[PDB]
Design a protein around this ligand. Sequence first.
Ligand SMILES: CC(=O)O[C@H]1C(=O)[C@@]2(C)[C@H]([C@H](OC(=O)c3ccccc3)[C@]3(O)C[C@H](OC(=O)[C@H](O)[C@@H](NC(=O)c4ccccc4)c4ccccc4)C(C)=C1C3(C)C)[C@]1(OC(C)=O)CO[C@@H]1C[C@@H]2O
Ligand SMILES: Nc1nc2c(ncn2[C@@H]2O[C@H](COP(=O)(O)OP(=O)(O)OP(=O)(O)O)[C@@H](O)[C@H]2O)c(=O)[nH]1
Ligand SMILES: Nc1nc2c(ncn2[C@@H]2O[C@H](COP(=O)(O)OP(=O)(O)O)[C@@H](O)[C@H]2O)c(=O)[nH]1
Ligand SMILES: Nc1ncnc2c1ncn2[C@@H]1O[C@H](COP(=O)(O)OP(=O)(O)O)[C@@H](O)[C@H]1O
Ligand SMILES: [Mg+2]
Lengths: 441, 365, 429
Amino acid sequence: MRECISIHVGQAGVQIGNACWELYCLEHGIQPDGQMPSDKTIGGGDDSFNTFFSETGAGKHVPRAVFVDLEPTVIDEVRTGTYRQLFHPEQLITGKEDAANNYARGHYTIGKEIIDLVLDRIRKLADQCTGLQGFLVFHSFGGGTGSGFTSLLMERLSVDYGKKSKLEFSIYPAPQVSTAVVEPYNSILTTHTTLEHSDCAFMVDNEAIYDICRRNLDIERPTYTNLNRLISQIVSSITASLRFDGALNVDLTEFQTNLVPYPRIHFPLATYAPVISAEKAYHEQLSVAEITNACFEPANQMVKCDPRHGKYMACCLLYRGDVVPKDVNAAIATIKTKRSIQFVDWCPTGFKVGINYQPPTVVPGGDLAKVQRAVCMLSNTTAIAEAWARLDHKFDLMYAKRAFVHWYVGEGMEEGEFSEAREDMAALEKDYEEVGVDSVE
Amino acid sequence: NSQVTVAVRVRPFSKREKTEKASQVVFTNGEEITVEHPDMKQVYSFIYDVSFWSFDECHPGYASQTTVYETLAAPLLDRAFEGYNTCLFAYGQTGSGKSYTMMGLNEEPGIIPRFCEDLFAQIAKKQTSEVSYHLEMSFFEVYNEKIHDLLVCKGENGQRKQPLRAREHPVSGPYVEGLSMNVVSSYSDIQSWLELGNKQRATAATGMNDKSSRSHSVFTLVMTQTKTEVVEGEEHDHRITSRINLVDLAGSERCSTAHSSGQRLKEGVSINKSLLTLGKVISALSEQANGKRVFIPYRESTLTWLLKESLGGNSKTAMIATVSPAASNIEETLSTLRYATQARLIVNIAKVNEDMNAKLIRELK
Amino acid sequence: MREIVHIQAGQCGNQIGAKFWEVISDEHGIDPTGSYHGDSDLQLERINVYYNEATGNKYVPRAILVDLEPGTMDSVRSGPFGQIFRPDNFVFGQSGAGNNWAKGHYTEGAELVDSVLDVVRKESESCDCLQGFQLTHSLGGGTGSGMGTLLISKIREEYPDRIMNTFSVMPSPKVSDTVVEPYNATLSVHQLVENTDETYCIDNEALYDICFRTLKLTTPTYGDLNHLVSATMSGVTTCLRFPGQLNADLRKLAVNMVPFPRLHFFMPGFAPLTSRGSQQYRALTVPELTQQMFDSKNMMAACDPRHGRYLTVAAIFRGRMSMKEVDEQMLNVQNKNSSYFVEWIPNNVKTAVCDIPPRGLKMSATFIGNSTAIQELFKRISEQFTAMFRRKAFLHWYTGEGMDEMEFTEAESNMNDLVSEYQQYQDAT
Ligand SMILES: CC(=O)O[C@H]1C(=O)[C@@]2(C)[C@H]([C@H](OC(=O)c3ccccc3)[C@]3(O)C[C@H](OC(=O)[C@H](O)[C@@H](NC(=O)c4ccccc4)c4ccccc4)C(C)=C1C3(C)C)[C@]1(OC(C)=O)CO[C@@H]1C[C@@H]2O
Ligand SMILES: Nc1nc2c(ncn2[C@@H]2O[C@H](COP(=O)(O)OP(=O)(O)OP(=O)(O)O)[C@@H](O)[C@H]2O)c(=O)[nH]1
Ligand SMILES: Nc1nc2c(ncn2[C@@H]2O[C@H](COP(=O)(O)OP(=O)(O)O)[C@@H](O)[C@H]2O)c(=O)[nH]1
Ligand SMILES: Nc1ncnc2c1ncn2[C@@H]1O[C@H](COP(=O)(O)OP(=O)(O)O)[C@@H](O)[C@H]1O
Ligand SMILES: [Mg+2]
């Protein structure tokens, strides 16, 4: 059977993970105590789907997850919260010191002393599987942990496991909003390392969702307990085809093939169209077309990057609920007719489609409404080169004076590693340009 | 102005490398050192002030020991005999050919002995009994930002290397409290001091070599020149002094490709910090020479603090980097090429020298 | 478990620390007997940060008290919260320093420092994971400036990879409280610059202007001024004790705040501060906190940042808030007041949020800024310094205790260089 390991690293990972397993438990009928009263009421069924939850003989269902912070605060919310009786107590809080938003701290100094435990519990989880399909790493650029520890880990797994899909779900740093001075360095450092080991890194920025919740959900002052519920849904659609029935099922090695033309341009975006409040759940039809067109609106992207400044290479559309295929085909044609959406000449197909019959579920206490159908888009565009350039210019402005560097050297980093990582992102800026040049003869 | 002469020595292939047939990655086109990875991907190009192509003895521009000396060091001697200060830094990884360039062997001698003997020869030529000279030298090290004396008789016990401290004299600038100084008249009485110091200099076995350098080293030669005026009034009062500093620097050493812990880690961090501050100083001095006045962070390291008066004002500074051309050490050579550089390094792609079998565009033309 | 050591030296540190432990204890629900009488369970999970435990569910603070006169200590003992401290940590001699930095550094303090370190080496080894140190002292005097910087040098050699956070009341511009004030401060800055990682510069005249304008206090005493400093001390390290959305610590702030190793003198502040009558007329929101934070009239440093540029600042929040409000508001400052910020640091702001506010306030905010306007404090002292040293006004009381004139000139240059290093970034090309 199909089995995936969800890893959450740092604070941006955990607070997302707490929202995900909140949702995974509801879709499958699991209480926070790991129990499933419906199955003993039913007498059958594998709704306790062994993709995300392992099962013991006593009826308790235990999630396939490991998450670690290198500080004990955020996990300790889980070891004393409402989901304590769900998880395995082997959660890593060997975080007596934090990474101080330093790569050099999550990659070396405190980058070790914690990793041998992490690889062991994973190896235990993998030894309980009848077949793996890949990993799901939830982290954040900008920190030391989500940047450094994520890189060291991705290096080791590429040795022990090798050819297994590794899908990252990371918080991309925003152009204006930012909660740290040294974000540009930490992003360029792990981006250099994770490039040769990852397979597809799904980008999200916190600045776009602030506007989505404003314009669509009509929330005027949201916090991270809202941004992380939407991110919980993007993942469910990706991993829905491994749990529930469907017409056109999509495995995890299918994103790796259709959305990654060349091995270094595996940075796609994401979004979720029918993000509406309960009130606006009326007054609208929410058909396949109205939902599918919204995914191509530049204002409904979960990353701050205008795709109209670039060209599309590949787009995977994952539908859920009461959806009929002809409605998808009619809609995808309407998009290729519109001229503001330019595709590369070397990809005349462009689109992938996936359809499922299990609609999304409503986390109670939430802001999203109940719908019959829901859509998740994943796109690879040349516009994101603009965002790589913003980081490189911030890098150069404050590296020309060697600012904040003595905090990284103080941990074991060399002065040259900054250059070695700035040159690889100047080659990436060209590869995104070379791809976008239409061919000639 | 006071510019900084950066130079590079490309060592030739050794016997081990020729037997293993280690291929060449560092090439020259005259005014450029180029690095072409065996994958034929991003090709790096560096433009320095002086390039020393010691690669093959029959290539044009072959950089002999005498060539290197006359190119870099002798102007520092001519400057010292004017009443100004000079500093020569030596940087390189282990096995790159740094000691060959600075000291030399029993034969093919290097900058240290060449400079010393030429200095003494010019002193002899300028001796008159109207003009007199006096030479006094010292030799010390820097280890985890602590100063140690290398010319002190020490026994064997725990924590014996007593640390000295830096102090700032209002006129003469910074100096070391308690550092010894010894008078000299030739090179045969320098060699026995240097051989005493280089045995007390800190070393430790690591993944690069079983005897690597883990502390910065400073050899300072202080010249005093006395003159007398014929007015029957200035009795041996015209004094002018100069300082020649020769600084052996330790390598960066990445702690990623060398799993270490404890004292070696601390040593690496300290060395790294020192090198970073030195780079900031040299770049700021270059900007100062090019006109834009700036602030030199001398005070962020013992080395720069002690060498303050020898890297500023009316002075001369040279930095000799040493790099190996083998493909077995891309990361270190590129690290040493990216370090020693004041201008901007350029990168391109140049696998298209195989357009059509030695292009042969002669036909097209 | 992150842990902090508190060292209180002089009459200013102890009279501040006595409110500090009276502010942290009232948070974690500890009463003067060391016993717990709280309501919430989050008060105990991270009690190990500042307090150690005792036998009968009693809690003894990890405080170390230092002085050269017993008057300070008897006030703490015969006081509100004196029965909680460890009596074996009340270290003191007699015959104070006479406002002589020499006496506290070389002559008298050296006969007492070895007893102080015996306590520090004891408390630290009793901890699981030490995060840093915490010193409250004063410049302008002998003990705080001499004994403090002496303990800094010794602890730094023993624990160089830990933080050394130092709260220090700097000398005021208009009216002094000692005559040899610049002699003692310049020699302290020579030690703090090289050895500390973050120091928070406080000026009493700034605190008087706060009590008069904002709080409308007519007769403020020293028990009130320190009731403001205790707030800043508590806000900085709150994210080590209580949970939150975007957490932080002492080291995360030092990284973002210290671009170069020497520029770690900060301009602190605290919100929301108001009068007892005008509390009914103010809406307590995140923007109303930000406008108060970045106001020149709520800085405790007595230096106008509008005469300089911010290299990098920090803003620690506490309460149930929304993270869009924080990011949007701290952005609006950089875009509006673009000239008071550095061009080669794109986002000059660090942010942190905790979910547990103060005893009776829905929210609060703590501010840390590193600005070039601290240039004026050191430039001012040097003019006072050379005006005295040029004629040796009082230099014979310092040389008589084992010091030279050369040591006075070192402290002046290192101060004047730092003055320039800050000025190097008040200029654009
Ligand atoms: C109904 C009401 O508004 O009561 C407030 C109050 O009137 C005001 C004036 C309080 C009051 O402030 C003062 O009276 C004061 C006097 C001198 C110096 C500084 C403050 C208050 O004392 C302050 C006190 O706040 C706290 O207790 C915090 O926990 C504070 N700790 C202590 O005050 C404290 C000290 C010793 C023993 C027990 C508690 C604190 C500050 C920072 C971090 C942690 C805790 C509170 C609610 C008030 C009073 C009591 C009037 C304010 O104080 C602070 C720093 O929050 C001033 O603005 C706030 C809130 C109000 O405006
Ligand atoms: N979407 C989202 N982002 C978060 C959340 N928490 C933190 N972040 C992001 O994380 C970024 C900073 O990196 P951190 O996640 O704090 O780094 P870290 O993994 O915690 O590593 P340390 O800082 O050493 O603890 C900020 O830009 C935030 O936007 C969250 O709950 N949701
Ligand atoms: N904020 C504050 N500052 C104080 C207090 N008491 C003394 N000071 C400051 O401390 C300085 C006196 O130095 P001090 O250390 O007490 O002298 P010492 O006792 O001989 O070491 C003065 O400049 C005061 O500004 C106080 O209660 N609060
Ligand atoms: N110009 C040169 N010609 C030939 N060999 C050289 C030259 N320069 C250096 N070498 C070789 O380099 C070696 C010195 O390397 P080593 O001293 O171990 O490195 P380091 O100088 O960094 O300590 C010598 O054995 C010598 O054969
Ligand atoms: Mg964190």
